């Protein structure tokens, strides 16, 4: 229990101190140590193997010196670990064979062979020579550092007497291997105590690097002079610096292989000594080698920070990195750990907080160029956490803080930070946005320009749509930030809409546009994915693809960028189209040697075997992978991209799916199997569309929506590519658009590809997707191509009018309801509910809906009441009150209960709202996504009437969770006209939290003035204004303060004069009458305008 109080370094030292008194050969000490080690292992909820395995590379390493004498100590250690003597021996063969080989001649290798193969009737020689060939890299490593054997014949002879069956000296030319260089530099022990013994092995591994790389074929044999350090002349230092950086990205590839250990091959001792190797290469290497592979060690140190026991060494390795490197080439990596500092600060002990203080004071004194003006988010984020305490440490840094906040517009650097990948920076951006907007509300000058706030709103919508099935919490706080933004005016605020643009059209046949496609796909999505990768294997695969794309573009194998060539204008003007934030990261790996084919375990599956029963991201990755490896054949430049989609999140697969499918289209006259796999994906699209879609809950249908969208994308890309191909084919190649009857045979296959799985079924599977404009497009296509003289216009139109009545457009809905659809009179009644005589249609629906023959003619009445704000008339309906209560579990009554809860919220009455949730909570398993939102808002209001602030905050946070995971969708695709129905609910969820968060009237009045400020960004449309004022109304009459009642009269007066300016004085009168029990001195004037708009002038 002295060890239980310690942490990562001292803990591992004290465990070795536990074991070297475990083997003290005193019997009492041995049994007491077995007992305490086992109880310590169980009270840490571990086994003794996974307690002592982080020091088993150290403990039994010196037992390679004494494995013949201390057989009983090794036997005690293997009975403590609970494994066999072989099982810990083939997994820790990496650590003791580099010492058991190189020692004195009477080897312990015979016993390690006697255990590593059972019985001498199994032959020890071949197993001995293949274990000696198994870890020969570490043997070379220890031979070069721990003894200084810089003579190759010494290595050869000291092998061949330990194994005479060893192949032709050593396994030849494997000394300048990347793995041997990595295992050399992993043995750089480093501490704050720079000792002479710590400089000795530092110089030894530096001189072994000098032996291995700069002159190997010159100096295979004569290497005894390299053991000296200072005989290294300046004739050979720059040749060493040249040969080091053709030989540094692969040793970081080996480092990336053995940090992110995928099969559980090793513990974190490997990770500690990889971080030691990174630290050695940060100190002892030229600067151009470290500017080069910075994005290797970034996501090596990220995995070091992520794992718990290797955090301190990785912070110290960053501290080494942050000062051996300049200001501007540090911007690429500073966000990912300033986020880790600010988001994982709480569990840091004293030592980790001291080393992070030593990060930050170094970063703010000597490298304030990065922190202040190169990216000012990294200082405002550190100021934004008061638990850290930046400003008291310097004091003069506060002089820079209190002017760097003002002069830097902060919105677009929240915008391009929310498109990141790792969860730490997009929790810090959310925690900074919810404090930024909270400051800007009280500051009353958040910008709404007719630096746009709609940029960060679109970023937040895309962030919440990205994480709909992963980490509900950041979608919660993301939707809370969207609510803090509020409803934008839909007129003067719009998203980016990069649709009429360069528009992703690239011919994959000509060279001049294929190179433009590759430079575009490198610039916009491969360069960001190169930095923001999670595991380093994905970053290596992105590096491979982004290298081979440069190799196809004629930039890699020859080198020209040093400007000493200059006879390459065709390559320089090509290179200039890269931007600098991609240029700096694409420059090193022109000459790199990434090669990760890894083939012949592929098994191409035939197509209609569907992948739907696993997920969407399973399906699109497997389908894209089944396509592009069966239709490219290693010369077309989309072949390398297959290395990305065994670790994709589904985004890059969905990106490349139209391009690879369109390149499979142009393979003609079936002939080859390239059109045989086309017939596979036609029936795979048939498997997508003609599916069941019932019998499954609300997540397999969500995956089916995504499977719809991913292959609507390929249809519009085939159509777009074919039309631009016709356009530029008739533009440049002649003018008369017909030629040669063979590119016409290309253009016919898209035409049967856009007429297969045909319409009446694109529209059927797209209107349920909620892309209502796309469904309207396919419905009009299957109006024109369908012979519309015939009578298919009955089943065509019962959903065609649905595709207009929530698209926003009325003037075609009113035009289709009165043209070729005039059979039934009820259809003529449904024209009235959009044309100013809506109440003439309401009371017709009230008696059509009181026939009790259909379930849907009731919900037509309820939706028509809700669309015309008749909330009090919804909650008084007899469709719910049979006598007092409602019916059981809900086939279609969920569509009724949603409207009922929402109207019960919008009229604030605790009795009609408090017994509605008595009926909701009598149900068993509420599946409906839409009921539970208004339920949670209802119980927020019921708790807010019980003067209970934390409970109503709890239920409003439930509402934000449900909106951020379920209701919310993708930005940059939809309008703002369809997001607005959700933004009004979010804007009404924020003001309930903002009016509940008050203790007395002094801040309650200030909250109401801030909400009146929030009623100025709202626009002037009637529906969101009436919704938000109805929710402040429902707050102010469930909390029976007298100041809330004085607020309530103001809300009713604003509802009244809102509704009489919007030609809806039906409710302006019955809202102004609430201002007469209070007897305001102003309602005598307001009733005059209500009388005026009604039509009576003289009164």
């Amino acid at each position: 229990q002295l060890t239980l109080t310690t942490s990562n370094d001292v803990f591992d030292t004290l465990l070795l101190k536990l074991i070297d008194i475990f083997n003290s050969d005193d019997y009492s000490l041995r049994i007491m140590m077995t007992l305490q080690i086992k109880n310590m292992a169980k009270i840490l909820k571990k086994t003794p193997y996974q307690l002592l395995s982080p020091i088993l590379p150290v403990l039994l390493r010196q037992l390679g010196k004494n494995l013949v004498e201390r057989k009983v100590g090794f036997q005690n250690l293997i009975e403590l670990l609970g494994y066999s003597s072989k099982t810990i021996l083939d997994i820790f063969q990496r650590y003791i064979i580099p010492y058991a080989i190189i020692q004195y001649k009477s080897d312990v290798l015979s016993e390690i062979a006697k255990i590593m193969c059972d019985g001498d009737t199994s032959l020890i020689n071949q197993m001995k020579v293949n274990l000696l060939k198994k870890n020969s890299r570490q043997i070379f490593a220890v031979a070069l550092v721990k003894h200084g054997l810089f003579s190759l014949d010494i290595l050869e002879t000291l092998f061949l007497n330990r194994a005479p069956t060893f192949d032709k000296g050593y396994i030849t030319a494997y000394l300048p291997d990347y793995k041997t260089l990595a295992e050399i530099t992993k043995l750089y022990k480093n501490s704050v105590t720079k000792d002479a013994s710590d400089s000795e092995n530092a110089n030894m591994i530096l001189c072994s690097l000098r032996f291995l790389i700069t002159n190997f074929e010159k100096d295979k044999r004569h290497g005894s002079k390299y053991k000296n350090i200072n005989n290294w002349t300046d004739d050979q230092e720059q040749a060493f610096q040249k040969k080091l950086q053709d030989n540094i990205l692969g040793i970081f590839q080996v480092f990336s292989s053995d940090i992110h250990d995928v099969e559980g091959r090793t513990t974190y001792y490997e990770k500690l000594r990889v971080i030691n190797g990174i630290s050695f290469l940060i100190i002892y290497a030229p600067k151009k080698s470290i500017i080069s592979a910075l994005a290797q060690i970034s996501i090596c140190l990220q995995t070091g920070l992520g794992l718990k026991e290797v955090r301190y060494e990785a912070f110290r390795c960053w501290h080494l990195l942050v000062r051996h490197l300049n200001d501007e080439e540090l911007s690429t990596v500073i966000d990912s750990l300033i986020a880790f500092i600010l988001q994982k600060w709480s569990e840091f002990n004293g030592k980790l907080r001291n080393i992070v203080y030593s990060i930050l004071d170094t970063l703010i004194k000597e490298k304030s160029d990065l922190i202040l003006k190169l990216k000012p988010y990294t200082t405002l984020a550190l100021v934004g956490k008061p638990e850290l305490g930046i400003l008291a440490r310097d004091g003069q840094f506060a002089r820079m803080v209190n002017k760097i906040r003002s002069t830097t517009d902060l919105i677009p650097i929240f915008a391009n930070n929310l498109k990141s990948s790792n969860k730490y920076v997009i929790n810090q951006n959310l925690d900074d946005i919810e404090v930024y907007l909270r400051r800007k509300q009280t500051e009353r000058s958040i910008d709404f320009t007719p630096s746009d706030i709609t940029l960060v709103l679109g970023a937040l919508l895309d962030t919440s749509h990205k994480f709909r099935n992963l980490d509900k919490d950041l979608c919660e706080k993301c939707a809370k930030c969207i609510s803090m933004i509020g409803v934008l005016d839909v007129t003067k605020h719009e998203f980016k809409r990069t649709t009429y643009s360069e528009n992703e059209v690239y011919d994959l046949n000509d060279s001049v546009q294929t190179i433009k496609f590759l430079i575009w796909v490198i610039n916009d999505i491969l360069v960001p994915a190169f930095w923001q990768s999670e595991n380093p294997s994905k970053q290596l695969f992105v590096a491979l693809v982004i290298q081979e794309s440069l190799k196809y573009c004629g930039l890699s194998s020859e080198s020209w960028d040093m400007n000493h060539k200059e006879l390459y204008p065709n390559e320089a003007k090509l290179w200039e189209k890269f931007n600098s934030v991609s240029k700096t990261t694409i420059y090193p790996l022109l000459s790199s040697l990434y090669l990760a084919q890894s083939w012949k375990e592929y098994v191409p599956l035939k197509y209609p075997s569907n992948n739907f029963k696993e997920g969407y991201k399973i399906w699109v990755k497997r389908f894209t992978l089944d396509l592009l490896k069966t239709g490219t054949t290693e010369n077309h430049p989309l072949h390398v991209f297959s290395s990305l989609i065994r670790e994709d999140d589904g985004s890059l697969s969905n990106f490349l799916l139209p391009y690879i499918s369109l390149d499979i289209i142009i393979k003609a006259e079936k002939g080859t199997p390239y059109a045989d796999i086309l017939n596979g994906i036609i029936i795979e699209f048939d498997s997508i569309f003609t599916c069941n879609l019932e019998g499954m809950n609300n997540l397999q249908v969500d995956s089916l929506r995504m499977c719809y969208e991913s292959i609507f994308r390929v249809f519009e890309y085939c159509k777009k590519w074919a039309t631009e191909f016709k356009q530029n084919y008739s533009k440049l190649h002649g003018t008369f658009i017909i030629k040669d009857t063979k590119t016409t045979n290309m253009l016919l296959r898209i035409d049967e590809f856009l007429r297969t799985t045909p319409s009446d079924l694109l529209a059927q599977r797209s209107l349920e997707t909620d892309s209502f404009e796309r469904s309207a497009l396919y419905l009009e296509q299957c109006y024109r191509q369908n012979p519309h003289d015939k009578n298919q216009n009955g089943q065509l139109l019962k959903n065609l009018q649905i595709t207009y009545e929530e698209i926003g457009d009325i003037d075609s809905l009113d035009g289709v309801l009165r043209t070729f659809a005039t059979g039934n009179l009820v259809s003529k009644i449904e024209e009235l509910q959009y044309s100013e005589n809506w109440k003439l249609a309401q009371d017709c629906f009230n008696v059509l809906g009181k026939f009790s023959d259909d379930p849907k003619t009731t919900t037509r009445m309820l939706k028509s009441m809700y669309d015309h704000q008749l909330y009090s008339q919804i909650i008084s309906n007899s469709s719910f009150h049979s006598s007092d209560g409602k019916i059981s579990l809900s086939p279609d009554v969920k569509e009724w209960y949603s409207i009922g809860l929402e109207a019960a919220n919008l009229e604030g009455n605790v009795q009609t709202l408090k017994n509605w949730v008595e009926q909701i909570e009598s149900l068993r398993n509420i599946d409906d996504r839409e009921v539970l939102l208004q339920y949670n808002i209802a119980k927020a209001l019921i708790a807010i009437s019980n003067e209970d602030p934390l409970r109503t905050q709890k239920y409003i946070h439930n509402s934000f969770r449900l909106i951020g995971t379920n209701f919310i969708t993708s930005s940059k695709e939809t309008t703002l006209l369809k997001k607005q129905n959700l933004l009004m609910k979010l804007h009404s969820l924020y003001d309930l939290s903002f009016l509940s968060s008050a203790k007395d009237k002094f801040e309650y009045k200030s909250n109401t003035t801030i909400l009146d400020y929030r009623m100025e960004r709202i626009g002037a449309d009637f529906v969101p204004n009436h919704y938000i004022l109805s929710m402040r109304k429902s707050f102010d009459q469930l909390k029976m303060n007298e100041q809330a009642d004085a607020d309530l009269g103001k809300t009713f007066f604003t509802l009244a004069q809102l509704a009489r300016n919007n030609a809806r004085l039906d409710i302006a009168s019955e809202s102004l009458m609430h201002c007469l029990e209070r007897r305001l001195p102003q309602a005598e004037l307001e009733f005059a305008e209500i009388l005026w708009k009604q039509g009576e002038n003289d009164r």
Binding site: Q1, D26, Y27, S28, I31, M32, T34, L35, Q36, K38, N39, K42, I43, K45, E79, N469, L470, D471, K472, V917, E918, I920, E921, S922, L923, R924, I926, L932, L933, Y935, N936, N958, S959, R961, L962, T965, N966
Partner: protein, 422 residues
């Protein structure tokens, strides 16, 4: 009635089969209702309590007529419901664990106390016991800690008594009965209805006392006393060797003895909890579960299995033989000063028993409190972990020193004896 309650529990199959951990996207946006969960928790707990009640009224019948109760279907149905209760992969309901092991106690206790014991034993397979005893081993190695009984924490290692089923039950009063008001508030009481009255689930919980945690530890320590008590019974049933008295009652019981001596000495001495004595009764009981396994059942204590626990067996015997030194107590004056430090709660207990509840404890004639200042002294010795009872010293002596098996050599044994004196 037994067969009906067993297949009644297999009807309510899903109450004892909620998973350990839920989805990360298991959104808790839901009406959060407790009334149906309260009903089927009451159904399962009253059903298991009724199984215990059936078997204890069957235990009270004359001892010639047990075969009118038992057949194949009784034991198959209880085998199913016992695998259901003492779960492995699902969230444990502790209410049914008490009753499900007390049923096994009643079964072993009547196999010991019937004349035609063969018919029960020939009716029971070996697989029934070797599926029972492994779940008892998995129950005996769980942790009992006051500060996180009523917490929801890591699975299958802490007996924890969930917040959402905290009521009494039909035999024994097991929690503080926090869900007893909700049984009354499950109906409208002025109305004739079928659906339940709505009980909000997150209204419960409101911080005053961790004494509730101490008495729930008291029940869980009696539960472990129960488990190793039915171990003690089925040593006596299967006095001859079988599949089940098979040497793993050295492994699991010596792990238990060694750890509950270890964290007693490291953690509990001077912690003024009521549950110390019972916790140092468990060790004092399980030594005997070692001891009669050592003396009377050595024919199956296999040599490979003894060395799996040779650490813990020898160390646990050593922590009894260390008490033969006894340079701590030796008098009366400082022992009562020690029991002010470790055992003041039992002074409160014996004064409340003496002034209210014990007929012998008034007009104490200076021979009945000179037994009290013998037995409080040996109690506080047995709590202070130095000076246990002499009989348990002898039982621990005649395992290590005795030559039925060479645990230690003669030069390894005196290395243990020098760490006392000797």
């Amino acid at each position: 009635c037994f067969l009906f309650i067993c297949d009644l529990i297999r009807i309510y199959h899903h109450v004892l089969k909620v998973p350990i951990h839920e989805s990360n996207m298991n959104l808790h946006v839901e009406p959060q209702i407790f009334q149906y969960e309260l009903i089927d928790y009451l159904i399962i707990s009253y059903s298991f309590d009724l199984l215990e009640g059936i078997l204890r009224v069957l235990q009270s019948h004359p001892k010639q007529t047990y075969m009118e109760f038992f057949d194949e279907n009784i034991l198959k149905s209880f085998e199913f419901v016992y695998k259901l209760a003492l779960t492995i992969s699902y969230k444990p309901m502790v209410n049914v664990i008490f009753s499900a092991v007390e049923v096994v106690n009643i079964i072993t206790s009547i196999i010991l106390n019937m004349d035609n014991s063969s018919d029960l034993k020939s009716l029971i397979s070996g697989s029934w016991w070797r599926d029972c005893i492994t779940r008892l081993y998995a129950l005996l190695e769980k942790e009992i800690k006051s500060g996180d009984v009523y917490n929801e924490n890591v699975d299958t290692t802490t007996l924890h008594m969930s917040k959402y089923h905290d009521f009494f039950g039909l035999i024994r009063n097991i929690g503080d009965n926090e869900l007893g008001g909700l049984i009354s508030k499950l109906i409208y009481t002025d109305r004739l209805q079928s659906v339940p009255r709505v009980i909000s689930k997150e209204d419960i919980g409101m911080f005053t006392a961790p004494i509730i945690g101490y008495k729930m530890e008291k029940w869980l320590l009696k539960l472990k006393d129960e488990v190793l008590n039915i171990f003690e019974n089925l040593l006596m049933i299967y006095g001859d060797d079988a599949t089940i008295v098979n040497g793993e009652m050295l492994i699991h019981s010596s792990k238990f003895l060694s750890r509950e001596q270890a964290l007693m000495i490291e953690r509990y001495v001077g912690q003024d909890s009521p549950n110390l004595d019972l916790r140092c009764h468990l060790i004092e009981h399980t030594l005997t579960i070692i001891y009669r396994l050592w003396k009377d059942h050595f024919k199956q204590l296999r040599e490979e299995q003894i060395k799996q626990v040779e650490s813990q067996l020898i160390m646990s015997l050593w922590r009894f033989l260390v008490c033969q030194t006894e340079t701590v107590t030796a008098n009366e004056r400082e022992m009562r000063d020690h029991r002010h430090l470790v055992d003041s709660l039992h002074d409160l207990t014996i004064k409340d028993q003496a002034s209210y509840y014990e007929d012998a404890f008034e007009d104490l004639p200076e021979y009945i409190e000179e037994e009290l200042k013998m037995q409080l002294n040996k109690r506080t010795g047995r709590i202070m972990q130095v000076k246990y009872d002499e009989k348990f010293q002898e039982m621990a002596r005649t395992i290590l020193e005795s030559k039925s098996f060479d645990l230690t050599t003669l030069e390894e044994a005196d290395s243990l004896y020098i760490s006392m004196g000797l």
